[PDB]
């Protein structure tokens, strides 16, 4: 043709949208996709102008607010002491995966610690049950088959008090995903942990408490809750072949390359 | 009475809303405000359920999207090299104020580097002028008269190409703040930098380029742009006496104490 080299193939891949549908040389093939991508950006810029990550967050938010959950925006930079009290003693391996800042703080790898503190505090003022959720940045260092972003966006919703049954947790999860239009399958001995899967991809691990950990945070009460990664949801929804197309990036905007 | 001690005064302050309007002992005075705050949280929980920080961000966003600016969500964790190229060589004092992560990255103290990269990249696909903005987390270590949060939320909008005049920048700024209902005053030799003030509080320092720095980022073109802190805007809008009431916190929710 000649056969495109791997490098040229990779370059073309970067300019390829799932929707896009031999002979021609690298030059024209690339020049074709380049104008398509520019046209895509021009359409976005002309009509909507909303970012996928931002928009999803706004949509996830209307969802939970519309049905009783209080919107939480807690600190992204948390005390290391919070991570230990979660069961990740400096001994565990996950301890190295945490991005530290100073000899005290770090980058919140999950939303749990801050929601725990909120459940405790709010239980002294809000009627039963207590429903909350938080959408925001999280951090974990990666290795191996890195289909994992180091800077990702999490959605953690939870309820405490009445109705905290695996039947209800499953229902919230189901309405939630059918709302977003994302195909999934639920799978679950005791210490009830649910895995919401999409294909062979784990969409989220849910938890039906109470659990031994509850006591460290002053909870001691029933509760249900699930965590989701927004980027993963976007990867699935938009059929991106690589999760990085849905991450905060300088390289992609709504899954379209910015290196045109 | 006896005179409330400072400590009791501080404790009561924490439970005081701007709206709230001697003799009685500490116990009753505290017990009064405690039920008020709980009632406030109960009203929020019953009706709206939206967080101030989140909601403002959503409102700021509709504003700029509605009028031509592309919504950007770039990385919060950026390369240190980006900070230097901004003019903050390891020598400068501000260099210590940056929260580092690894021998390479750090916590973005401002949105500039990532918007610069976007202006360059998008100029090769979008018509003139190029309008963008980003709302998100930022980080700076503080000292002195710390009316400064270390973890704050920034709004940086900018335009490149046609219309980049101090007259237009002032207009966007004005429509923007009158939209939010925030009283402000603009004040400005060359290298045109504008300071949007509210009382003696600086709401934002705006910039009318081009500026010598532009070239390091590959810009070389006219542009205007302003940065704002959402927490400061909330402090003002809601009349909070302390900016920390508008920060992501475990201690306050929409300016109401969570230690009830």
Question: Keywords for this structure?
Answer:
BirA Bifunctional Protein, domain 2; seven-stranded mixed beta sheet; homodimer; 260 residues; three-stranded antiparallel beta sheet; alpha+beta; elongated; Helix Hairpins
Q: What is the CATH superfamily classification of the largest domain in chain A?
A: Bira Bifunctional Protein, Domain 2
- For the record, the CATH class of the largest domain in chain A is Alpha Beta
Structurally, the number of domains of chain A stands at 2
Q: What name does the CATH topology of the largest domain in chain A carry?
A: BirA Bifunctional Protein, domain 2
N-to-C terminal Cα separation of chain A, in Å?
Answer: 24 Å
What is the largest interface, and how many residues per chain? A-B, 50 and 50 residues
Give me the oligomer status.
homodimer
PDB class: ligase
Keywords: tRNA, pyrrolysine, translation, Structural Genomics, RIKEN Structural Genomics/Proteomics Initiative, rsgi
Assembly: dimeric
Entry title: Crystal structure of the catalytic domain of pyrrolysyl-tRNA synthetase
In short:
The structure is a homodimer of 260-residue chains. Chain A has 260 residues and is α+β, with helices and mostly antiparallel strands.
Describe this structure in words.
It is classed as ligase. The entry lists the keywords aminoacyl-tRNA synthetase, tRNA, pyrrolysine, translation, Structural Genomics, nppsfa, National Project on Protein Structural and Functional Analyses, RIKEN Structural Genomics/Proteomics Initiative, rsgi, ligase. The assembly is dimeric. The entry is titled "Crystal structure of the catalytic domain of pyrrolysyl-tRNA synthetase". The structure is a homodimer of 260-residue chains. In chain A, strand 11 (252-253) and strand 12 (256-257) form a beta hairpin. Chain A folds into 2 domains: 1-49, Helix hairpin bin (Helix Hairpins), CATH 1.10.287; 50-260, Bira Bifunctional Protein, Domain 2 (BirA Bifunctional Protein, domain 2, 2-Layer Sandwich). The two termini of chain A are 24 Å apart. Chain A is an alpha+beta fold and 260 residues long. Chain A contains 8 helices and 12 strands. Helices cover 35% and strands 23% of the residues of chain A. The longest helix of chain A is centred in the N-terminal third of the chain and has 21 residues, at 26-46. Chain A has helices spanning 6-14, 26-46, 52-66, 80-84, 94-97, 112-123, 166-180, 230-238, and strands at 70-72, 77-79, 100-101, 105-107, 130-139, 151-160, 185-187, 193-198, 201-208, 223-229, 252-253, 256-257. Chains A and B meet through helix 2, helix 3, strand 1, strand 3 and helix 6 of A and helix 2, helix 3, strand 1, strand 3 and helix 6 of B.
């Amino acid at each position: 043709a000649p056969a495109l080299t791997k490098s040229q193939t990779d370059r073309l891949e970067v300019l390829l949208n799932p929707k896009d549908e031999s002979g021609k040389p690298f030059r024209e093939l690339e020049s074709e996709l380049l104008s398509r991508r520019k046209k895509d950006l021009q359409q976005i810029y002309a009509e909507e102008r909303e970012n996928y990550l931002g928009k999803l967050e706004r949509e996830i938010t209307r969802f939970f607010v519309d049905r009783g959950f209080l919107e939480i925006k807690s600190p992204i930079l948390i005390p290391l002491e919070y991570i230990e009290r979660m069961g990740i003693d400096n001994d565990t391996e996950l301890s190295k995966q945490i991005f530290r800042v100073d000899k005290n703080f770090c980058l919140r790898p999950m939303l749990a610690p801050n929601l725990y503190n909120y459940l405790r505090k709010l239980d002294r003022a809000l009627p039963d049950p207590i429903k909350i959720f938080e959408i925001g940045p999280c951090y974990r260092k990666e290795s191996d088959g890195k289909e994992h972003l180091e800077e990702f966006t999490m959605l953690n919703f939870c309820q405490m008090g009445s109705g905290c049954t695996r039947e209800n947790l499953e229902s919230i999860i189901t309405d939630f995903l059918n709302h977003l239009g994302i195909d999934f399958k639920i799978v679950g001995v005791y210490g009830d942990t649910l895995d919401v899967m999409h294909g062979d991809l784990e969409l989220s691990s849910a938890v039906v408490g109470p659990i031994p950990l509850d006591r460290e945070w002053g909870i001691d009460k029933p509760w249900i809750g699930a965590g989701f990664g927004l980027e993963r949801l976007l990867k699935v929804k938009h059929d991106f072949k690589n999760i990085k197309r849905a991450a905060r990036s300088g390289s992609y905007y709504n899954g379209i390359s910015t290196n045109l």
